[PDB]
Design a protein around this nucleic acid. Structure first.
Lengths: 193, 181
DNA sequence: AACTTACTTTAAAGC
DNA sequence: GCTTTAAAAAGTAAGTT
């Protein structure tokens, strides 16, 4: 079963283009779970997709649960339960698995057509949003999408709400919502066109 | 002691199991409930929706029922009495009065202030927070066994308690943890 | 966009 | 575990207008 496990990890890592250290952390977590029952009968497909999620979190390599859910052929149901299970079942703490919205800026910026200037302004907006307590409860993707959108404008490398919404995997309405709040509450002076 | 002077709870739903003490012929009970759904293949009971006490009733051949949607115990008492009379109208006889047991109560409320759930998730022990999936902190209260959903606005949802005093105790226990910071 | 509707999270008899 | 029910919270999603 451990043979089929590592084989699915290759599908996951190939589809997600996961780097060696993340893939290796996923496998190591899995064997760490093997020694710990792996539950009476928690699916061999569920635990590994869980592991890759926790691996990406532990290593700060952003990977929205959506992205891992489809390529693994399944849903947030058993995925979430096995994740949540293997998480505290192991040495995993909310602090170690904690991923900031800024942790997604690089991946999404790479897909949008980079520029360290833009990535920097987005991280500043995101850091500033936290300090001004405007982030609690909001999803990371929605906040990073708006920040990235606002930064592209500020730095003169405009990207449309539609382009940003598609890489972040949120709707344009969500980007519009987060972006309008960030602009007003942080008093950002966004230029025209 | 823990300051509950700003806590406000509101009953949103009460779930009760009931025993009518009579065998029921579901095919014949269907005429009693207008609009009732019954597919014995997928679920063994009739899904009945009352208008007056606006509640849903799941009716089983064993004479047991589950009443949900109730905002009060009186809602449940009246639903049981209406069904009981309808049953009598069709020939059913009961060995004794209905046994009503509240099994679950869902409350919505306010704990007094706002929270930065990111901080809560890192300071409140034994809680869950996954803003990528849901905007609230899931907190499991051991005794009395229940769950409280805490949101940034300070609003909450308490589920699982079987009485009002229990839900108040569950909130008191959560506030004991939140107030250490 | 706004509205509306809707999805995420949290006993019963028997498979 | 599952099937069916109800209810709220706040965020996000989708179909129409």
């Amino acid at each position: 079963n451990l043979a089929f496990a590592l084989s699915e990890l290759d599908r996951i890592t190939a589809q997600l283009k996961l780097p060696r250290h993340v893939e290796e952390e996923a496998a190591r977590l899995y064997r760490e779970a093997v020694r710990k029952g792996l539950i009476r009968g928690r699916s061999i497909e569920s635990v590994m997709a869980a592991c890759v999620y926790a691996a990406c979190r532990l290593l700060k390599v952003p990977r929205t649960l959506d992205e891992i859910a489809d390529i693994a052929r399944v849903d947030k149901k058993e995925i979430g339960r096995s994740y949540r299970f293997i998480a505290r079942n192991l040495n995993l703490t909310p602090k170690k698995l904690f991923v900031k919205p800024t942790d997604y800026v690089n991946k999404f910026a790479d897909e949008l057509g980079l520029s360290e200037k833009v990535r920097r302004r987005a991280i500043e907006i995101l850091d500033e949003a936290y300090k001004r307590g405007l982030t609690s409860g909001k999803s990371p993707a929605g906040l990073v999408a708006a920040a990235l959108y606002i930064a592209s404008l500020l730095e003169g490398e405009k990207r449309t709400q539609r382009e940003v919404a598609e890489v972040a995997r949120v709707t344009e309405v969500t980007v519009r919502n987060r972006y309008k709040e960030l602009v007003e509450k942080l008093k950002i002076k966004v230029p025209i066109a | 002691m823990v300051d509950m002077s700003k806590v406000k709870l509101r009953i949103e739903n009460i779930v009760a199991s009931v025993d009518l003490f009579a065998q029921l012929d579901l095919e014949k009970v269907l005429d009693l409930c207008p609009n009732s759904k019954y597919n014995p293949e997928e679920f063994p009971g009739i899904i009945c929706h009352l208008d007056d006490p606006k509640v849903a009733l799941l009716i089983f051949s064993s004479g047991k029922l589950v009443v949900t949607g109730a905002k009060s115990v009186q809602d449940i008492e009246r639903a049981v009495a209406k069904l009981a009379q309808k049953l009598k109208s069709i020939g059913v006889k009961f060995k004794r009065a209905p046994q009503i047991d509240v099994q679950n109560m869902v409350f919505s409320g306010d704990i007094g202030r706002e929270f930065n759930l990111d901080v809560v998730a890192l300071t409140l022990p034994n809680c869950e927070y996954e803003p990528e999936q849901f905007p609230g902190v899931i907190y499991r209260v051991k005794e009395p066994k229940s769950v409280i959903l805490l949101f940034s606005s300070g609003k909450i949802v308490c589920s699982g308690a079987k009485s009002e005093a229990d839900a108040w105790e569950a909130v008191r226990k959560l506030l004991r943890e939140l107030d250490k910071y």
